[PDB]
Amino acid sequence: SALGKLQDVVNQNAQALNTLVKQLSSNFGAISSVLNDILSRLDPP
Amino acid sequence: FASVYAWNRKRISNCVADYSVLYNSASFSTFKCYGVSPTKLNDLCFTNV
DSSP: OHHHHHHHHHHHHHHHHHHHHHGGGEEEEEEOOSSSHTTSSSSSO | OOOOTTTOOOOOOSSOOOOOHOOOOOOOOOOOSSSSSSTTTTTTSSSOO
């Protein structure tokens, strides 16, 4: 009133989940990152 | 109609754009859209033309 070996696990796991969430906003070479804006202004082919 | 090296640009704004009077009109030789589909232009909204 020390615990860094326990805070390291919490931090590493949050840092991985954040990267997974944030990769949902890359185009990977498409026109939009959001699927609804490809579906709305393009036709199936 | 101006020539190819001094083409004229008109900005369109503040109006409903009905491509229905244009897409169901069989009077043009080429109608090629890129990034959009000429049948879904009445569902979108645009910032400028």
